[PDB]
């Protein structure tokens, strides 16, 4: 393939693989075997698991874009692989959002965290997060299927699509995004005060980078959906959007390769243990 958009897309995702697989492998190693299962660590553990699943599945996206047609694997194979990808992705997203909510709760309600915020609670909420992600990606499992589309069968599928895509958009974009903005705004605000005033700079840098990377990674992926409900393919803008869709997927996955560095190794303990284990 020689189309500008796809030849960019393959580079950025193969990179996403190169950064992520060692990144999520290192972080999963550290957090699941090299470090205690404490609450501050369990969020990162589940997050790197989702991120590593996304990285492991990404080579399917690389091959798929490379051929730009047909489908090597089975019908159930395509019914799963996409679903596993989106599960990993939105599980990462919701774990980012739960990390933000925990970071907010320990500042907004310190005494209540001192009492009730324990590994049992955290693991239960992680279970709920995986449950909601799994429910949000069974609507692809139920309809993602094979198609002819060439001399060789290629996997693809097409009210119903609106009902799934807008729901996914809302729950994966507005809810996590607004919750992150609110939580980090509150954490920066409470940083105005007492011993925290010196650290507004650090807190704001972290808040804005961890939210900005999320935003740039995910905003294209979400906005192209509402654009696809605004306009059709087989149009200049339409064909444009469906060609840059691969770059959109590349960015959505790139979030997954950023996440280890941006959350786990953004914390001193995970940095120390990764250095102490590599």
């Amino acid at each position: 393939w020689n189309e500008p958009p796809v030849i960019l897309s393959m580079v950025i995702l193969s990179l996403t693989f190169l950064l992520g697989l060692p990144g999520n492998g290192l972080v999963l190693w550290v957090a699941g075997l090299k470090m205690q299962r404490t609450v501050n660590t369990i969020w990162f553990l589940h997050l790197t698991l989702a991120d590593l699943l996304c990285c492991l599945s990404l080579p399917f996206s690389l091959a798929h874009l490379a051929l730009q047609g047909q489908w090597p694997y089975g019908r159930f194979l395509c019914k799963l692989i996409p679903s596993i990808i989106v599960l990993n992705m939105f599980a990462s997203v919701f774990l980012l959002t739960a990390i933000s909510l925990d970071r907010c709760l320990v500042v907004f309600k310190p005494i209540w965290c001192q009492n009730h915020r324990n590994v049992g609670m955290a693991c239960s909420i992680c279970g709920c997060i995986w449950v909601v992600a799994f429910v949000m990606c069974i609507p692809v499992f139920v309809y993602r299927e094979i198609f002819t589309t060439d001399n060789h069968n290629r996997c693809g599928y097409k009210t119903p699509l609106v009902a799934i895509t807008i729901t996914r958009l809302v729950v994966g974009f507005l809810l996590p995004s607004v919750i992150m903005i609110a939580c980090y705004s509150f954490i920066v605000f409470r940083m105005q005060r007492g011993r925290f005033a010196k650290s507004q700079s650090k807190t704001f840098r972290v808040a804005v980078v961890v939210v900005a990377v999320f935003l740039v990674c995910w905003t294209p992926y979400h906005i192209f959906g509402v654009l696809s409900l605004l306009t059709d393919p087989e149009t200049p803008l339409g064909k444009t959007l469906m060609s840059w869709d691969h770059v959109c997927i590349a960015l959505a996955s790139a979030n997954s390769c950023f996440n280890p560095f941006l959350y786990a190794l953004l914390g001193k303990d995970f940095r120390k243990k990764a250095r102490q284990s590599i």
Binding site: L65, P82, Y157, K158, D232, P233, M242, H246, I249
Partner: peptide
């Protein structure tokens, strides 16, 4: 009609 070549992950 609108299916197109999704990059997976959708």
């Amino acid at each position: 009609y609108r299916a197109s070549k999704l990059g997976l992950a959708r």
